[PDB]
Write a protein that binds this ligand. Structure first.
Ligand code: HEM
Length: 154
């Protein structure tokens, strides 16, 4: 798939707002993921012990990982489809070290859209959501192909 420039502009315009508060958005997104699909929490030996939303919100460690996640994702989106070099080391660790199935990437994709919609309604109308969805689908497609190359395709 290929996004048009107008679609990239919609994605990067809401992303610019997200970057006004990277830590807060990262926390919101990971907490939404873990609440909506608690099985994903099991992949994180680091966070496995967190029992309630309250404990999640109070974890400095979770907040630091959310910054790491959104910073990496941001770097990929700003490549506007030219993200081959960035995707390679990402795919290798998520496939053979952490073992993250494509299904879980769909789940975090859903969490990202939920948080953007909730915090940025005026810059995240139907057309901008459609563009963000297509960018994240482009990302999952490319990761699926890489997984396969790497011998995981999970
Ligand atoms: C937008 C999707 C995601 C991005 C951009 C992302 C990014 C990252 C980055 C940059 C790291 C640190 C370096 C590394 O280990 O490769 C990391 C670690 C990790 N990720 Fe992801 N990730 C994503 C989705 C997920 C999902 C869906 C899960 C699990 C359900 C996951 C599980 C992990 C684990 C277990 C670690 C190691 C945490 C630790 O330090 O103990 N990732 N991720």
């Amino acid at each position: 798939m290929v996004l048009s420039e107008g679609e990239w502009q919609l994605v990067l315009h809401v992303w610019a707002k997200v970057e006004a508060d990277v830590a807060g958005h990262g926390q919101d997104i990971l907490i939404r993921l873990f609440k909506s699909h608690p099985e994903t929490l099991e992949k994180f030996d680091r966070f496995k012990h967190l029992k309630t939303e309250a404990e999640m919100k109070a974890s400095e460690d979770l907040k630091k990982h959310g910054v790491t996640v959104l910073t990496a994702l941001g770097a990929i989106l700003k490549k506007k489809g030219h993200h081959e070099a960035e995707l390679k080391p990402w795919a290798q660790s998520h496939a053979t070290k952490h073992k993250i199935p494509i299904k879980y990437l769909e789940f975090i994709s859903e969490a990202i859209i939920h948080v953007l919609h909730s915090r940025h309604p005026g810059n995240f109308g139907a057309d901008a959501q459609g563009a963000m969805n297509k960018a994240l689908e482009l990302f999952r497609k490319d990761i699926a192909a890489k997984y396969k190359e790497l011998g995981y395709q999970g």
